[PDB]
Design a protein around this ligand. Structure first.
Ligand SMILES: Cc1cc2nc3c(=O)[nH]c(=O)nc-3n(C[C@H](O)[C@H](O)[C@H](O)COP(=O)(O)OP(=O)(O)OC[C@H]3O[C@@H](n4cnc5c(N)ncnc54)[C@H](O)[C@@H]3O)c2cc1C
Ligand SMILES: Cc1cc2nc3c(=O)[nH]c(=O)nc-3n(C[C@H](O)[C@H](O)[C@H](O)COP(=O)(O)OP(=O)(O)OC[C@H]3O[C@@H](n4cnc5c(N)ncnc54)[C@H](O)[C@@H]3O)c2cc1C
Ligand SMILES: *SC[C@H](NC(=O)CC[C@H](N)C(=O)O)C(=O)NCC(=O)O
Ligand SMILES: *SC[C@H](NC(=O)CC[C@H](N)C(=O)O)C(=O)NCC(=O)O
Ligand SMILES: *[C@@H]1O[C@H](CO)[C@@H](O)[C@H](O)[C@H]1NC(C)=O
Ligand SMILES: *[C@@H]1O[C@H](CO)[C@@H](O)[C@H](O)[C@H]1NC(C)=O
Lengths: 461, 461
């Protein structure tokens, strides 16, 4: 009936926060409507990366013959086959095991877990409609709303329902021969890369001239250009204006430039996500912003006493590690030692990665943002363009592009943006240095590791 | 016939130093007896990593079927083939191409290049026997000796001449079916990994219980154990006492414990390197240590006025980036602006990598060294053991092992030691942070990147 901490949402932030609270001794209840691990584990980071690994390997196999390997076998694009149904099962099995582990951990850390739809009632308590069909009402001293987000559909577009969202991607049981992905965000860029690496004719529809418009132009241009060069059909300056189903059962996409894409087996909208508001938040007076996101201050406090919110539902830096960290720091503050009274997450200079092909990474501000904030006169930029040594033995090539953005007379690194193989793994350490206030001189103050790609970052202009 | 700077040795340090000196306006002469780029380019870092890419890809292809790819093709260990002769040709082509680029750069940066054996005469000048069949004598105000090293042969062992060294590895025209590598050093560990990944029955002979005994025990144990598990035959507590050749043309290697390895096609000694002397060191008074290495102070000064030395010939931290950096800083000091009159390389906390399978990385001191230096009571160690997500879809597995060694009440990071896929690329950034004086709290002060392996380093114990 009554708890110290009740968490609505079994995702990245909810799970982390519940666990941290319980670690400090706090009768904690966690309510999840679907599966533990939320978006990341079930239809996000995890299954996307597994598919990424498959796509990545498909490409690598096409290099083997040149690398002198398996020369009696035709390891080329033409003979590429991918057993989508079987791989799908293994992927689902892995995700299912992770759910089990999560449920196991929460029980062992003494967090009570209930499955059902949670909602606020007028009294300020939480009604949970259970999966055993009962409906229980619970009370608590502290309540965290970490319900995450959900894909946006372009409901103004006739035929829009004929396509799915990223969740739909993960439900696909067969591989589409021809796929159209809409949106220049990282989710779409990643899915498009995966589809193409696995053999599907792949189309990516974007409003502007370049993908990944939230990132530095170096990332935008390199990924845009490489996607086009490798065979991903990028429709620039385009918006879908109508979708229809044929004789054949395939879709036909109608663009605003009057062009079209015919014989499409699958259409996926990846045009943003919105806050997953299903609770009775109105029943407790939780203020929403003009984008229907829950408002939260720097301590994750909503406007309502003893109600907190974080993660995608708030919508500030929508990444799994961020929610986890905010979740943990909130629990430190509410239930931890006195030294954590003012604990909060620093949301600036969070590094992030795009599992495109090639991968990309970014932390800090873009060159354009740096010029705006500090003025041209005070921005120094370092660039490096090269092809990794791995491609020396190959006719096919992939770009590596490193950009360091510096501000002030000490050349403080305010942005680091990279494109190329291994970027995902390279960035973390540099992230630690940048959070330490690293300058260009600091990057230069570590001897290089040879031969590597990362090495280029400590020996530029 | 007279120069500002004469550099003996066209390798990592020599080339870097010559170019930096010439950049400042200095009539510079570079003398190389073989090929520009030295050990690294011709018989070191470069061709070893190219071969590494081959073995790495060979392993990767054996995971493709599991990853649902090319399932009509038998992509297993049993069907592995490697066209060693053809790949050798491409590898040499790439190296030859790098030689050309170096010659091009140097003559573009106004360094005179002469091929020949250089030696000091009694006058203190340098006579060079050329390929003109000429023999000129040159004088200079400043002389750098950067002649590198060479493999040690165990001349006390009968039949020792029946094996080669790492140079010989790169001369191999055909793949040996059964190969023996001797020594626990990083060069032999790498070569053993390559041989095994490419299908040869591989044997590694070591004096102790573990490989890589200069590194932290975590690296030693993990690589040792994985090599055994893999199928690399590691002969521990052993030493070769006799080598012989049969009828057959194959070798029989006799051990000190009365065991044997017969039908061996190739034997490679990788038991250390020694300074490559042979110039007229004696004619000029250059002092050598008890290991026959040239002595050099913190400014790379030998005991002789206007004669400097660095790189493998001195033998302090034998890596390409180190020689390059020392070469550059020397030129800054000798010919650069007033600013650099006390420029010198910091040889502490130089990061280094081992291209084993899996790769490993290390910077700073081992746990044992820390305890010895700071005392048990002041050392805290963080460990993390896990299998990368890539293996989730596979039956075969590979370990990832991260160790952070901390000293003092601020938990200053004094050692970072890692084993696992991507380690080579992960380490650099962390190296920058350690040279900044990173503490554990600093590692923790950057938000994680999910999903990656590096992530584990900023979220530990
Ligand atoms: C395709 C895709 C790929 C991504 N890849 C990455 C990546 O590689 N790296 C990364 O850092 N981030 C990635 N993200 C983002 C990441 O998934 C999110 O930032 C993260 O999941 C947010 O966690 P959260 O706790 O805010 O909410 P979520 O993780 O979304 O979990 C919210 C939970 O609340 C539950 N819930 C909602 N309402 C109720 C209710 N009323 N009662 C009970 N339960 C309820 C939902 O079932 C859900 O389980 C990806 C996202 C997507 C969509
Ligand atoms: C198998 C192997 C793998 C390695 N892998 C790596 C790696 O991955 N990363 C890394 O950082 N390091 C690696 N190293 C180490 C690296 O190669 C050396 O540290 C580096 O080459 C040292 O450069 P140097 O300038 O000191 O001498 P070198 O690079 O050895 O060059 C010395 C030059 O001097 C010339 N010379 C000698 N005497 C004379 C003379 N009398 N007249 C004219 N010329 C002369 C030689 O021909 C040679 O070209 C590896 C080494 C080996 C052997
Ligand atoms: S990825 C190569 C880099 N390109 C960019 O940085 C583009 C930046 C935008 N154009 C900006 O916002 O202005 C790069 O290194 N460019 C170097 C160059 O000289 O163009
Ligand atoms: S790679 C795993 C780590 N092992 C070691 O550090 C071995 C060290 C030596 N054998 C030694 O200290 O004698 C590891 O995680 N060790 C954890 C530990 O508690 O030692
Ligand atoms: C189609 O829509 C895009 C996206 O807004 C726009 O840039 C482009 O100009 C439009 N094409 C037309 C109207 O010709
Ligand atoms: C063989 O040599 C190794 C290395 O010195 C030593 O450890 C071992 O004890 C020797 N074995 C015997 C039986 O002498």
């Amino acid at each position: 009936k009554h708890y110290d901490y009740l968490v609505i949402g079994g995702g990245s932030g909810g799970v982390a926060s519940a666990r941290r609270a319980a670690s400090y001794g706090a009768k904690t209840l966690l309510v999840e409507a679907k599966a533990l691990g939320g978006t990341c584990v079930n239809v996000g980071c995890v299954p996307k990366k597994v598919m990424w690994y498959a796509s990545d390997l498909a490409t690598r196999v096409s290099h083997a013959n040149e690398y002198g390997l398996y020369q009696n076998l035709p390891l080329d694009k033409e003979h590429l086959t991918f057993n989508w149904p079987e791989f799908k099962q293994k992927r689902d099995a892995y995700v299912h095991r992770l759910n089990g582990i999560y449920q196991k951990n929460l029980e062992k850390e003494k967090v009570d877990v209930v499955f059902g739809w949670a909602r606020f009632n007028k009294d300020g308590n939480v009604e949970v409609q259970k999966r055993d069909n009962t409906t229980e009402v619970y009370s608590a001293n502290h309540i965290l709303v970490a319900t995450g987000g959900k894909a946006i559909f372009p409901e103004n577009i006739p035929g829009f329902e004929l396509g799915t969202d990223s969740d739909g991607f993960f439900r696909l049981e067969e591989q589409p021969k021809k796929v159209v992905v809409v949106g220049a965000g990282y989710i779409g860029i990643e899915l498009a890369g995966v589809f193409h690496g696995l053999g599907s004719e792949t189309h990516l529809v974007i409003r502007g001239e370049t993908v990944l418009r939230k990132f530095d132009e170096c990332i935008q241009n390199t990924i845009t250009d490489h996607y086009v060069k490798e065979g991903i059909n990028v429709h620039k300056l385009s918006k879908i204006v109508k979708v229809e189903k044929n004789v054949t059962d395939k879709l036909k996409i109608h663009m605003n430039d009057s062009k079209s894409i015919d014989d499409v087996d699958e259409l996926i909208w990846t045009i943003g996500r919105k806050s997953h508001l299903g609770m009775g938040s109105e029943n407790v007076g939780i203020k929403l912003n003009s984008h229907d996101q829950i408002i939260a201050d720097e301590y994750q406090n909503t406007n309502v006493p003893n109600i907190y919110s974080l993660g995608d539902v708030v919508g500030k830096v929508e990444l799994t590690p961020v929610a986890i960290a905010a979740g943990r720091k909130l629990s430190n503050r509410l239930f931890g030692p006195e030294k954590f009274r003012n604990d909060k997450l620093d949301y600036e200079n969070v590094p992030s990665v795009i599992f495109s092909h090639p991968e990309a990474g970014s932390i800090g501000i873009s060159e354009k943002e740096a010029i705006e904030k500090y003025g041209k006169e005070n921005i120094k930029v370092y660039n490096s363009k090269f092809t990794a040594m791995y491609y020396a033995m190959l006719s096919e090539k992939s770009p590596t592009r490193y950009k360091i953005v510096c501000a002030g007379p000490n050349e403080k690194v305010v942005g680091l943006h990279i494109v190329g193989d291994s970027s995902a793994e390279i960035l973390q350490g540099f992230g630690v240095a940048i959070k330490m206030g690293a300058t260009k001189a600091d990057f230069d103050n570590c001897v290089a590791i040879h031969p590597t790609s990362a090495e280029e970052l400590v020996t530029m202009r």
